[PDB]
Amino acid sequence: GKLMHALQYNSYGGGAAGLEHVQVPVPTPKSNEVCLKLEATSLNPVDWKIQKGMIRPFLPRKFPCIPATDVAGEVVEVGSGVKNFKAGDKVVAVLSHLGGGGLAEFAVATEKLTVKRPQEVGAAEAAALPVAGLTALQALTNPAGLKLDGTGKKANILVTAASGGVGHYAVQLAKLANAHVTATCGARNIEFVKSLGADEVLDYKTPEGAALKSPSGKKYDAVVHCANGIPFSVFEPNLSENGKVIDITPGPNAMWTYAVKKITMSKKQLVPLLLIPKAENLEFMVNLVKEGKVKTVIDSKHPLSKAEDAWAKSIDGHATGKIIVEP
Ligand SMILES: NC(=O)c1ccc[n+]([C@@H]2O[C@H](COP(=O)([O-])OP(=O)(O)OC[C@H]3O[C@@H](n4cnc5c(N)ncnc54)[C@H](OP(=O)(O)O)[C@@H]3O)[C@@H](O)[C@H]2O)c1
Numbered sequence: 396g397k398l399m400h401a402l403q404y405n406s407y408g409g410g411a412a413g414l415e416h417v418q419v420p421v422p423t424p425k426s427n428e429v430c431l432k433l434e435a436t437s438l439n440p441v442d443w444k445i446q447k448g449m450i451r452p453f454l455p456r457k458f459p460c461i462p463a464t465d466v467a468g469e470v471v472e473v474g475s476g477v478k479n480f481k482a483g484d485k486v487v488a489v490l491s492h493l494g495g496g497g498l499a500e501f502a503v504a505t506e507k508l509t510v511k512r513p514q515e516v517g518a519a520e521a522a523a524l525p526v527a528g529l530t531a532l533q534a535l536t537n538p539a540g541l542k543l544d545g546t547g548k549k550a551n552i553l554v555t556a557a558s559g560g561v562g563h564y565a566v567q568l569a570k571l572a573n574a575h576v577t578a579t580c581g582a583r584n585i586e587f588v589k590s591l592g593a594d595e596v597l598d599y600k601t602p603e604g605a606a607l608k609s610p611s612g613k614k615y616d617a618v619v620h621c622a623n624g625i626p627f628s629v630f631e632p633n634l635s636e637n638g639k640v641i642d643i644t645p646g647p648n649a650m651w652t653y654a655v656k657k658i659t660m661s662k663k664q665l666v667p668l669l670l671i672p673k674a675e676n677l678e679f680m681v682n683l684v685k686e687g688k689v690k691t692v693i694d695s696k697h698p699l700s701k702a703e704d705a706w707a708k709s710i711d712g713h714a715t716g717k718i719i720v721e722p
Contacts, residue, residue, distance in 0.1 A: 397421040401499035402702050403459040407448040411707040416700075419461075421501045426476040428503045431468035431486060434518035436497040436720045438463055438709040439526045439560065445492075456493050462706075463497025463720070464490040466504070467512060467522035477506050485512040487521035487681060489529075489672045498702050498720060510677045513685050520691040521681060523717035527560035528680045528689075530670045531568050531619065534561075534641045538666045539617035541572035550574040551613045551635065556621035557593060558584040558715050561643060565619040566591040567689050577609050579622070584715055587692075607633050617641055627652055627665055640665045692716030 399421045404413045424430045442462045445454045467487040470480050480486065488504035496502040512521050535541045541550060552569045556562040557578035569576045570592035578593040581600070588596045595611065597604035599622070607629060609615075614635040620642045630640045642649045645667030652665045683689040694714040697705040702720045709718055 399500040400699060401461050401496075402699070402706075403461045403498075404446050405459045407446065407451075409446065410443075410710060411703045413446070414462075414703045414706050417459075419499075422496065422503045424472055424474040424477075424503050426474040427506050428474050429470050429477055429480050429486070429488075429506060429509055430472040430501060430503050431466060431488065432471050432501055433466055433468040433497070433499065433722060434485075435467045435522040436463050437465040437519075437522045437525075437527075437560075438705055438718045438720070439465065440709060440712070441492075441526075443706065443710045454492060455495070461496045461499055463495060464492055465522050465525040465527075466490060466497050466502055467518040468502070471501070474506075479506060480509060480511075485514070485518075486510060487512045487516075487518075487524060487677065489525040489677070498699065500699070500722060507674060508672055508677075510674050510681055512681060515685045516681060519693055519696065519719045519721065520684060522719065523560070523691040523693065524680050524684070525672060525677060526670065527717060528564045528691075529672055529676050530561050530643055530668070531564035532676055532680060533670060534565065534619045534643060534668055535568050535572060535617075538639050538641045538668065539619070541569070541574060543568065543571045545573060547572050550616040551609075552576050553607060553609075553615040553618040553633070554578045554593070554621065555599075555607070555618065555625070556580065557588045557591070557596070559621055560714065560717050562619070562621040563588075563591055563692055563716055564689065565621065566593050569619070571683075571688060575613060577613060577615065579604050579607065581713075587715065591692075605629075609633065614638065619643065630665075631663060634663045637662050637664070639663075641668055642666065643668045645669070694718050696721055698722070 470484045488509040558580040579599045
């Protein structure tokens with residue numbers, strides 16, 4: 396019965412204050428799970444949303460909850476039925492949102508959602524990938540219908556909040572797909588988003604950025620919508636005839652909009668997106684980082700002993716790239 400350091404919250408609404416440092420049993424791998432000694436964990440906005448109560452009645456399943464799901468680490472123990480990993484292997488993995496366990500010294504992941512991390516890729520650089528990166532990949536690959544080898548159709552992509560976790564992957568992945576990328580962000584990251592490969596960058600505080608209006612007049616074929624303030628009517632004049640707004644933060648309004656735009660057979664569509672994590676895709680993204688085709692941008696690094704600072708930074712929402720917790 397080894398013990399570990401972890402952070403957990405015990406109730407809704409506590410913010411970073413409600414995040415409490417605790418000493419808890421190291422989890423035991425089931426027959427299909429692996430136990431990782433964590434080398435890096437990355438936060439996602441859904442992590443603090445769950446704690447706030449915004450994902451009720453789905454999450455969290457039970458209190459207390461150890462938050463975060465994107466991890467990179469070293470395998471220390473594998474389950475009786477695990478074939479692809481042994482102790483000592485460096486990996487990157489996605490933890491179940493049901494059980495969490497990223498802000499801890501150790502975590503268990505299923506074999507299905509664990510991928511070998513090549514030595515060319517650091518732990519933090521890899522831990523930033525699972526949620527943010529796979530979401531960008533899914534949005535551009537399914538609804539936007541792009542191909543990242545070069546077969547794909549030419550296209551105009553808008554990426555809102557291009558400076559955040561999903562956004563900053565989306566911009567880079569979109570360029571690998573030979574698309575014209577228009578991006579929105581704050582004034583301080585304009586040069587940053589340009590360096591990711593965006594053809595046009597808008598400051599969303601300016602009138603033109605708020606209208607999402609392309610400085611060269613482009614109509615968008617698909618929007619990877621990573622921000623939150625914007626009603627469909629703002630997107631509509633900027634969409635091509637059959638353009639899709641891919642809302643990666645679907646709420647009740649999005650769902651309803653989706654419904655009536657299906658019902659009324661609208662040519663311009665709003666499409667909710669719910670990430671489906673698959674190892675093939677994680678393996679694919681990790682490989683892109685290895686080959687230097689995609690770079691992970693890290694907002695900040697925090698030790699586990701001060702992880703409430705990383706949490707606060709997530710909550711605040713001004714992250715540029717991915718927030719990382721290290722041991
Ligand atoms: N459905 C799913 O499966 C799924 C998966 C992943 C994420 N999400 C959701 O998608 C959202 C974004 O995720 P994320 O990790 O990429 O967020 P994030 O990294 O935490 O957001 C940070 C960036 O967004 C920028 N931003 C905020 N408001 C903006 C606006 N109105 N216009 C342009 N930029 C803006 C911020 O810029 P400034 O500091 O300059 O203001 C900041 O740099 C979250 O709501 C998240 O829950 C959903």
